[PDB]
Design a protein around this nucleic acid. Structure first.
Ligand code: CL
Ligand code: ZN
Ligand code: ZN
Ligand code: ZN
Length: 116
DNA sequence: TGCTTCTCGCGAGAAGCA
DNA sequence: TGCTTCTCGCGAGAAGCA
């Protein structure tokens, strides 16, 4: 196998046999275990780097295009990810984006083709 | 440094199957 | 197909470099 189950109080966890990490969702555990097996590879279309998770590759690639999908709605400035946007708003606007705040807009990804 | 890269539950599309 | 199963984007707190 790649995991074993661990049931406490009827709550089911899925444990990675390699690093004993705990996962509520099995799909989560798979996504993780690929970093141990490298069974699937996610090569960047723009350079030679390869990634063990699809989302790593996607963040990387969007970084290649320079696209700025995250826009502060308080002053209009755009940012390439959640952390720059959040850091901006907290610091400049002394406000917290977390939750249904409507303090930022996430634009569709246009600089390359991903799910939407 | 307060500010890349990591983490994974959640659920919406995409792919697989019939 | 319409039904299910799978993929992975996303938030946002956390760990990690330097
Ligand atoms: Cl842009
Ligand atoms: Zn593991
Ligand atoms: Zn690349
Ligand atoms: Zn702003």
């Amino acid at each position: 196998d790649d995991h074993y189950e661990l049931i406490v109080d009827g709550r089911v966890y899925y444990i990675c046999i390699v690093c004993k990490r705990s996962y509520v969702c099995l799909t989560s555990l798979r996504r993780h275990f690929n970093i141990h097996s490298w069974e699937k590879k996610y090569p960047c279309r723009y350079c030679e780097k390869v990634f063990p998770l699809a989302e790593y590759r996607t963040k990387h690639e969007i970084h290649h295009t320079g696209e700025r999908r995250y826009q502060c709605l308080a002053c209009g400035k755009s940012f390439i990810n959640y952390q720059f946007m959040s850091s901006h708003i907290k610091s400049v606007h002394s406000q917290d984006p977390s939750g249904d705040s409507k303090l930022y807009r996430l634009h569709p990804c246009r600089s390359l083709q991903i799910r939407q």
